[PDB]
C-alpha cells in the first residue's frame, strides 16, 4: 500500500530497533519499489527494461509525495523528492542501508543484471549517474502534469541529482524532523508545566498532569537521543568504510548545513535533557 498513499510525516518515529546498526525513516520504508520487485535478452536490454521499470516507481514516488504535501509544492515537498530520490540512487548503487525484505528481492534482481563482478559496483554508480536526470524527471511529472515548463524551478534538478551517502541525507532528513518535533513536544511541556510569575513550588513537584507531560517528554527525548547516537555511530561506520579518509566532518556539521539556526550545544543540552527549558518545567530541585 506504500505504492498507494503515505502516511503522515512523523506519524511513524524513526526505527532503530529493526536493524540495530541504523535508523530507517518511515519516507524509506514506503518507498514506492512496486515495479523493481516485480523484475533471455542480451544484458543492455536489460539495463533498458530496469529503467523503465525505475521511471514508472519514480513516477509514482513523486506522485504520492506530492499529495502528501496536498499538493503545496513547498520546501517540505522538495526534500522529500530529494530524499526518495537519493534512497532510489543507492538502492540501484547496492549501498542502501535497510536491505529487508522486498529491498533484499531488489537486490536480488539487480545482481541478476548487474552481476556482481569487481566491475559490478562501478557499473551501476556509472548507470546511476547516467540515468538519475531521468529519474528526478519521472518523479517531478506529477509536477510537470499541473505547472507545465515551470515544473523545472520548483524545485532544483542539481540539489536533488548530487550524490551523497545514505547516512548523510538521512542525518539531514533527520534533524528536519527534530526541528519540526521538539517546539511541539516543549509546547506540551509549558501548557501542562507552565508556572505563574508568583508560584512557589513547581508545578512538577505535586501536579500529575505535569508530571506524565514530563514522562511523556522524557519517553520523546530519550528516542531522539538514541536515534542521534545509533545515526552518528553509523556515520562514523560508513566513514570508514571509504578506503581513503578525508582529512574532518561530523554529523552536526551536517545539521549545521541542513538546518537554519543550528547551535551543537543547545543541541546537545536538549538531547541530553539538561536545557533550561527542560530543567524549568520538570526538575522539581
Known amino acids: 500500500k506504500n505504492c498507494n498513499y503515505k502516511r503522515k510525516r512523523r506519524e511513524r518515529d524513526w526505527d532503530c530497533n529493526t536493524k540495530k546498526d541504523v535508523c530507517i525513516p518511515d519516507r524509506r520504508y514506503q518507498l514506492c519499489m512496486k515495479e523493481l520487485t516485480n523484475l533471455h535478452r542480451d544484458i543492455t536490454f536489460r539495463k533498458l527494461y530496469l529503467k523503465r521499470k525505475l521511471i514508472y516507481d519514480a513516477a509514482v514516488e513523486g506522485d504520492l509525495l506530492l499529495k502528501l504535501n496536498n499538493y503545496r509544492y513547498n520546501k517540505d515537498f522538495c526534500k522529500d523528492i530529494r530524499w526518495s530520490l537519493g534512497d532510489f540512487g543507492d538502492i540501484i548503487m547496492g549501498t542502501d542501508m535497510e536491505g529487508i525484505g522486498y529491498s533484499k528481492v531488489v537486490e536480488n534482481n539487480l545482481r541478476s543484471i548487474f552481476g556482481t563482478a569487481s566491475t559490478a559496483a562501478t557499473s551501476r554508480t556509472s548507470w546511476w549517474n547516467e540515468s538519475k536526470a531521468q529519474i528526478w524527471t519521472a518523479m517531478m511529472y506529477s509536477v510537470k502534469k499541473r505547472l507545465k515548463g515551470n515544473f523545472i524551478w520548483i524545485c532544483k534538478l542539481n540539489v536533488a541529482v548530487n550524490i551523497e551517502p545514505q547516512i548523510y541525507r538521512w542525518i539531514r532528513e533527520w534533524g528536519r524532523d527534530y526541528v519540526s518535533e521538539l517546539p511541539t513536544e516543549v509546547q506540551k511541556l509549558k501548557e501542562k508545566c507552565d508556572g505563574k510569575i508568583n508560584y512557589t513550588d513547581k508545578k512538577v513537584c505535586k501536579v500529575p498532569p505535569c508530571q506524565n507531560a514530563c514522562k511523556s517528554?522524557?519517553?520523546?527525548?530519550?528516542?531522539?537521543?538514541?536515534?542521534?547516537?545509533?545515526?552518528?555511530?553509523?556515520?562514523?561506520?560508513?566513514?570508514?568504510?571509504?578506503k581513503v579518509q578525508t582529512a574532518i566532518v561530523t554529523p552536526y556539521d551536517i545539521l549545521k548545513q541542513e538546518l537554519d539556526e543550528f547551535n551543537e550545544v543547545a543541541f546537545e543540552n536538549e538531547i541530553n535533557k539538561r536545557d533550561g527549558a527542560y530543567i524549568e518545567l520538570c526538575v522539581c530541585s
Open 217 to 242: 517528554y522524557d519517553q520523546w527525548i530519550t528516542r531522539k537521543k538514541n536515534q542521534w547516537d545509533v545515526l552518528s555511530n553509523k556515520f562514523i561506520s560508513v566513514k570508514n568504510a571509504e
